[PDB]
Chains A and B, each alone.
With several copies, the nearest count.
Chain A
Amino acid sequence: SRTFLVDPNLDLSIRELVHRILPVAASYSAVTRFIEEKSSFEYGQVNHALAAAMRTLVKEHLILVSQLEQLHRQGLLSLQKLWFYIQPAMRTMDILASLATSVDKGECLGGSTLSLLHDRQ
């Protein structure tokens, strides 16, 4: 549910494409807040191991941003080239940002958090 601001004076040929990359960040700022909260004991022994197995993917998402900066130094990273690289991340961090918002909507803990993972590449 995060909102962003870009620029009053920027090229329109960029802002329309910027708004196509951000939905992987806003869908990320709601997963990292699901980990740091649903790790509290008062949530059962299921909402824990769900937050742990939901953390290894965040680790692999931090490696995918590292390999981009190291590839950015050689200048081989154009904006158009970026929109294609993160596509595996725009699909995964769109799945987890939907479970982490549907497990907290209706307060689930225990079995009712193991049912939702059975109805929901």
Chain B
Amino acid sequence: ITQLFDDLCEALLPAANRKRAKRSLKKVAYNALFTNLFQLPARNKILMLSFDLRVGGLGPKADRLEELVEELEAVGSVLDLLVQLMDVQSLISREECLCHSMIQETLQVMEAAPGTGLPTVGL
């Protein structure tokens, strides 16, 4: 258990000082773990999220979320952790925001003061 918190702190560390940040992030893991410790069934919490699925459409996906928790019976504390954390018109509206987020990301640099967006001039 003293190591399973050390391997967890490695995965969430984004790859590239990577030798002292792990030492400081292990503090944020412990500084936050003991705040809750200082201070209801399991399957019901899924259904309350299954309901909110069906309301906004996408019925079969909600009929799948219940299909797996029924076979996961034949571990309960694991799913209790997960719950804590026009088809064409959307296509033409995606490939149009790209051309709005591609000509903007590069015109904001092409027209500015000489040497702002350039990293070599910042040396």
Contacts and interface: CB of A to CB of B under 8 A. Distances in A.
Contacts of A76: 92, 96
A43 interface: no
Contacts of A92: 120
Dominant secondary structure of chain A at its interface with chain B: helix
B88 interface: yes
Interface residues of A, number: 19
B115 A64 contact: yes
A71 B96 contact: yes
Interface stretch (A32-40, A81-89, A112-120): A81-89
A67 B120 contact: no
A121 interface: yes
B58 interface: no
B92 A63 contact: no
Nearest to B91: A67
B118 A71 contact: no
B96 A67 contact: no
Given A71-B92, A85-B92, A85-B114, A63 B99 contact: no
A89 B118 CA distance: 11
Given A63-B87, A66-B88, A67-B109, A88 B93 contact: no
A60 interface: yes
Given A64-B114, A64-B115, 5 more contacts: A60-B119, A67-B89, A71-B114, A76-B96, A81-B96
